[PDB]
Amino acid sequence: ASSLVGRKVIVATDKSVVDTKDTFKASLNLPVSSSNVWVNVYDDKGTVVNRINLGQQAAGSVSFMWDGKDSSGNIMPPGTYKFEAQTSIDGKTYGLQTYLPANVDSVTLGELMLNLAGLGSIALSKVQIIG
Amino acid sequence: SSLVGRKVIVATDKSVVDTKDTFKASLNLPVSSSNVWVNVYDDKGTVVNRINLGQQAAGSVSFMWDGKDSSGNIMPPGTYKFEAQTSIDGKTYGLQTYLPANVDSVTLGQELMLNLAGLGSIALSKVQIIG
């Protein structure tokens, strides 16, 4: 007799609660290959924190990491951060979907949903086939 | 380079099935349950089969369909619907299925989308971190 409560799942979202004591690891999907892909990192009020340039990447999934520091190398306090992945294809900028870890706080409500730390209630259609 | 022609995993309830091959996919189950199932229907909503999965733990549950109706007759290749559900304390709840689809082309919204075989234009928030 079990649930997801306490487990980490992977969610199609641009926010995640980060414990900056540990490396943060996640991915994005890139539908066309590109010479220039990146993730801007913001704090929970929209202020830029850092920029992760991923350089050239092939179509498919791309993994990335954030060490929890701002672009000045100072450790950021644990909390909710925003990850905006994008790419430049033929001189135009496109958004990419990120897949980010979240803890399940509880299960709630025909319709079941996950209550995800920092996200509120999320539908299962956003959650990755659970590991 | 393209993505075109690859197979991705989509939070959807429909998939183009080639019934000459076994069909394999997953659902997410948020709370463990003694009774989990997948109803299968043709593209007109006519019921084809019932895949009973019995008791399952919270997490990912994999399932397969051999392409046959409940009388053992091979169904024709085509779009099929997979409705995963469970029973929990006497109440029935839908579950999210994650099904394979072929990438026909890559296109714009909307603002990058996948045109998936049998599904149309689908947002990357519905697509599994691509293998």
Domain ranges in chain B are: 1-11+99-131, 12-98
How many C-beta atoms surround the C-beta of residue A127 within 10 A? Answer: 25
Question: Over the range B87-122, which residues count as b (16 or more CB within 10 Å of their CB) and which as e?
Answer: ebeeeebebbbbbbbbbbeeeeeeebbbbbebbeeb
> What is the spatial distance between Cα B38 and Cα B26, in angstroms, rounded to a whole number?
10
Q: What letter would DSSP give residue A125?
A: G
- Half-sphere exposure (Cβ direction) of A106: Cα atoms closer than 13 Å: 3
Question: For residue B120, what are the contacts with CB-CB under 8 A and spacing of at least 6?
Answer: none
| Among candidate residues A107, A114, A2, the one with its CA nearest the CA of residue B32 | A2
Cβ of B129 and A128 within 8 Å? yes
Residue from B4, B69, B23, B22 nearest B42 by CA: B69
For domain A13-99, give the CATH number: 2.60.40.4070
What's the angle, vertex CA B27, arms to CA B69 and CA B130, rounded to 5? Answer: 110
Q: Which among B128, B87, B123, B116 is positioned nearest to B14, based on CA atoms?
A: B116
CA distances from B116 to B1, B18, B29 (A): 17, 15, 25
- Residues of chain B positioned with their CB less than 8 A from the CB of A96: 112, 124
- Measured between its terminal Cα atoms, the distance across chain A in Å is 18
Among candidate residues B3, B26, B2, the one with its CA nearest the CA of residue B102: B3
What is the chain A residue with the closest CA to B87? A110
Cross-chain CB nearest to B124 (options A1, A3, A97)? A97
For residues B126 and B131, what is the distance between their CA atoms, to the nearest angstrom?
Answer: 14
- Residue B85 CA to residue B93 CA, distance in Å, equals 6
Separation in Å, CA of A129 to nearest CA in chain B: 6
Does residue A102 contact residue A112 with C-beta atoms inside 8 Å? no
Nearest chain A residue (CA) to B7: A60
Return the residue in B102, B124, B126 with the most chain A beta carbons within 10 A, the one to mutate for interface testing: B124
Breaks following residues of chain A (C-to-N distance > 2.5 Å): 109
Which residues, in sequence order, are CB contacts of A99 under 8 Å at separation 6+?
A: A10, A11, A12, A13, A26, A27, A28, A29, A128, B129
| CA nearest to B28 within chain A | A129
CATH classification number, A1-12+100-131, choose in 3.40.140.10, 3.40.109.10, 2.30.30.910, 3.40.50.300: 2.30.30.910
Residue A16: CB partners within 8 Å, gap ≥ 6?
A24, A26, A80, A81, A83, A100, A101, A102, A118
From the number of C-beta atoms within 10 Å of its C-beta (0-12, 13-18, 19+), residue A128 rates as buried
Q: Nearest Cα to A111, choosing from A124, A98, A102?
A: A124
- CA A107, A12, B91 angle in degrees (round to 5)? 30
Q: Is the dihedral of CA B70, B72, B76, B77 positive or negative?
A: positive
Resolution of the coordinates, Å: 2.3
- Burial label for B61, CB within 10 Å (0-12, 13-18, 19+), is buried
DSSP state of A46: S
B26, B92, B112 ranked by CB distance to A129: nearest: B26
Tokens of A2: 């079990």
Cα angle B64-B69-B72, degrees, rounded to a multiple of 5: 95
Amino acid identity, position A50: N
Residue pair B105/B115 in contact by the 8 Å Cβ criterion: yes
| Residue A117 Cα distances to A17, A82, B8, angstroms | 7, 14, 27
Cβ distance B31 to A112 less than 8 Å, yes or no, reads: yes
**Nearest beta carbon to residue B125 from set A12, A59, A113:** A12
Is residue A101 within 8 Å of residue A65, measured between CB atoms? Answer: no
Measured between CA atoms, the residue of chain B closest to residue A125 is B11
Please tell me the class of the B1-11+99-131 domain.
mainly beta
What fold does the segment set B12-98 form as a domain?
Immunoglobulin-like (2.60.40)
- Name the DSSP class of B89: T
Q: Which residues of A touch B57 (CB under 8 A)?
A: 2
